[PDB]
Amino acid sequence: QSTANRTKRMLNIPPHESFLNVPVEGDRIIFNPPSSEASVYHTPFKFLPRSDPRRRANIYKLF
């Protein structure tokens, strides 16, 4: 295109569908598991020490 601003609009990609359902009259937390490969810092529950209280049911099971 002629200008950089026009190129930005033609190459636009909307955000994920989950980020479009904005709440009203308050704040909320939604479960949004991304379709991506998790890193190695998300340790599985099997590799967590017994003492670690962070071990907990799946986030799905909290909703």
């Binding site: 998790a38 599985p44 799946n58």
Partner: protein, 183 residues
Amino acid sequence: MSQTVGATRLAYSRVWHHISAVTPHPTLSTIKAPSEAITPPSLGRLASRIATILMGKHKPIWDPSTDCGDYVVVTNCAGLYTTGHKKWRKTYYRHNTRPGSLQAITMDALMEKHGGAEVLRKAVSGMLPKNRLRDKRLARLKAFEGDAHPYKENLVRFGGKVVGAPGWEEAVKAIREADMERL
């Protein structure tokens, strides 16, 4: 800039999708009721969905300059669905620049020589950007007349179940449940 800092390997990989030109498509059909009247995707409505895959426009990382397209295996092209009287009244024209040398052929006569796969390649070709990537993208459309093709092992799978198979959706939901057992 964090959102795009990471491994982009699998975002640019070529996925081998599959679709049958005979299987009814509730989304790409104009007859949405009753259940028995749902037709397959028409020639141009199937081609418009394929041209979107060949361009990689279904991805959130799409860029017209980068060739982030995928493969599409279209089977059962002999039973390509068409409305009205297109099959016997639509004409394809060709010229070689020499006056007098205009070549015309009907859709049914073009399906007797090169099958229905050629009629689909012409539709998808005209729906792709006219640039230096048009022939690469159109080459990733592997259309066959019957159910046989050499890519039955390339089709994307999830848990051993080919996408579009009877039980592929349940195989996908079972793998994501185990993914949540981590910090």
